[PDB]
Amino acid sequence: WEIDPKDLTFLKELGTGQFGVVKYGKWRGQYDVAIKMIREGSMSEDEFIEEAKVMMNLSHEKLVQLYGVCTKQRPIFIITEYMANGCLLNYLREMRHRFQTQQLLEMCKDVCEAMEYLESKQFLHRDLAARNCLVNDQGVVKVSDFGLSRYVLKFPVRWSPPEVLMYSKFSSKSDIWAFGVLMWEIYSLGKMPYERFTNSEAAEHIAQGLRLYRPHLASERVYTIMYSCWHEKADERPSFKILLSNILDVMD
Numbered sequence: 001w002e003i004d005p006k007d008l009t010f011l012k013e014l015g016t017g018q019f020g021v022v023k024y025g026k027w028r029g030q031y032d033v034a035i036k037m038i039r040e041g042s043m044s045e046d047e048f049i050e051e052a053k054v055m056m057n058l059s060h061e062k063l064v065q066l067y068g069v070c071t072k073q074r075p076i077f078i079i080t081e082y083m084a085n086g087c088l089l090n091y092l093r094e095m096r097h098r099f100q101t102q103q104l105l106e107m108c109k110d111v112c113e114a115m116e117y118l119e120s121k122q123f124l125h126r127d128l129a130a131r132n133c134l135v136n137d138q139g140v141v142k143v144s145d146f147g148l149s150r151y152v153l154k155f156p157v158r159w160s161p162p163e164v165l166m167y168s169k170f171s172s173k174s175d176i177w178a179f180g181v182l183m184w185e186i187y188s189l190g191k192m193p194y195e196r197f198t199n200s201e202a203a204e205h206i207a208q209g210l211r212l213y214r215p216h217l218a219s220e221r222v223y224t225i226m227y228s229c230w231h232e233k234a235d236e237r238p239s240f241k242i243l244l245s246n247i248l249d250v251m252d
């Protein structure tokens with residue numbers, strides 16, 4: 001639904017992400033909103049605005065909510081839920097936080113709750129990673145940019161299963177594999193997966209079967225969960241419903 005840009009007030013610069021400039025502001029002084037301004041030529045706009053009608057019908061406490069769009073201008077704006085602590089990759093990298101492993105397992109729980117919701121709606125994320133995850137004033141992790149890789153006009157080699165790398169075979173089981181890499185990202189405190197390798201070198205190793213080592217902060221019970229996401233046989237990989245159950249068991 002077409003938010004009138006007169007309702008919007010811009011107060012803080014939040015920097016740049018996928019498709020460009022992001023800002024913090026208020027809608028009619030009341031609500032805290034994030035405003036993404038779409039850099040021209042970077043997106044398939046008509047296809048996006050069309051999907052945005054169905055993305056607004058989506059709703060989960062751990063999914064960044066879509067307040068609407070401003071597609072009557074040049075450039076077009078996307079209005080969403082305000083996430084004060086920004087990108088999870090930067091939030092994890094800030095060593096001062098002195099995170100407990102229980103805070104890290106709860107980051108996985110959160111994301112997994114958003115992924116179980118998406119999975120049930122048969123909605124694929126296609127680009128699940130800590131860079132597409134946001135953190136709010138309370139330290140909660142919410143899933144963002146769900147399916148935006150479909151409209152983007154540098155590929156996520158480090159989060160891609162072997163069937164995607166050699167054959168481009170996307171499914172629930174591609175998001176499952178990506179989740180496992182994201183669980184590793186969290187426990188490794190924002191470490192770049194397969195950092196010693198280039199995009200092509202990292203892709204070759206994955207196709208052969210090299211898996212991400214156990215991050216020291218992760219217990220064997222934790223590593224078993226993320227390691228079950230990296231099965232060569234996609235059918236052997238659990239669903240987000242199975243993963244969540246396992247996270248909740250380990251929680252205890």
Ligand SMILES: *C(#N)N1[C][C][C][C](N2N=C(C3=[C][C]=C(OC4=[C][C]=C(F)[C]=C4F)[C]=[C]3)C(C([N])=O)=C2[N])[C]1
Pocket residue numbers: 014015016017022034035036055064066078079080081082083084085086087090134144145146148
């Ligand atoms: C990191 N570091 N970054 C880059 C700077 C901006 C920061 N930030 N971006 C947003 C944000 C993210 C996505 C938005 O638009 C969406 C969201 C979901 C979706 F499915 C489609 C879509 F277009 C809008 C704003 C926020 C924020 N929401 O607070 C922040 N902090 C992150």
